[PDB]
């Protein structure tokens, strides 16, 4: 993990795998984020470089935290950035791994 906590714009987060959301857990996290945001840990974000040095940010966990931040219409979400490679991505995506540029 990169050192500090980064505020990643929700709009740049790629979430390629489906998840089942419990609306009550989403609402519960919405409430907590408003009241005591420090109690909601950062999600983990994989930062991958494309072949031409493009930046890509993948989110594979923290579904309910992400849903809650989108509900609050936040610009960014606290995240730990994990510098990763295309090879790492392919573990998740297999033959859906894009030819990232």
């Amino acid at each position: 993990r990169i050192a500090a906590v980064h505020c990643v714009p929700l709009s740049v987060l790629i979430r390629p795998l489906p998840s089942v959301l419990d609306p009550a857990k989403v609402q519960s996290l919405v409430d907590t984020i408003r009241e005591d945001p420090d109690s909601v840990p950062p999600i983990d974000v994989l930062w991958i470089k494309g072949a031409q040095g493009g930046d890509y940010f993948y989110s594979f966990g923290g579904a309910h935290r992400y849903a809650a931040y989108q509900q609050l219409q936040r610009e960014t979400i606290p995240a730990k950035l994990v510098q990763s490679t295309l090879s790492d991505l392919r573990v998740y995506l297999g033959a859906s791994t894009p030819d990232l540029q």
Binding site: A4, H6, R15, P18, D55, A95, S96, P98, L100
Partner: protein, 184 residues
Amino acid sequence: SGNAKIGHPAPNFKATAVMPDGQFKDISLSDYKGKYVVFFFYPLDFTFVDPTEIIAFSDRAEEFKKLNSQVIGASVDSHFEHLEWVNTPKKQGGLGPMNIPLVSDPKRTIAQDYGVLKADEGISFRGLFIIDDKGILRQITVNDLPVGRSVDETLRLVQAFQFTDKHGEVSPAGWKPGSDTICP
């Protein structure tokens, strides 16, 4: 055995098929690039068991069409035999009219390529293969002879692959981490 490997190009074939209109056509797997393909094998035409699973995939062909996917069935029987079966009533253990093409594999080479040949009997196991719109093999399913495949399961898999495929249509973030992006 065979050459069907997940994440690699699905083995191509050219074969005579009986088409939904009842006509013969020689087709290749590669003709369906741009579409998902569900390619399935079954052992033999005209056995004493009703071809319930083939009828199910045919009956539900619209649910596959809605997912831009083509269903294709295959056995080692001739295309002439496939057509006789199509033209045999269901009450006589027949197929009835089909919404899907039925490939003929009389040389057993397609079954061999897909590693589903029961070599002693010279018939295919119940193999089913999900091939993406780029021609890449995504899913292998092979059942021993007595147990059928689920249309519901197959549609589950197609939609799940397509979900993650669609999320690969991305361009770079245009956002760069640095000292300025640490959360306050």
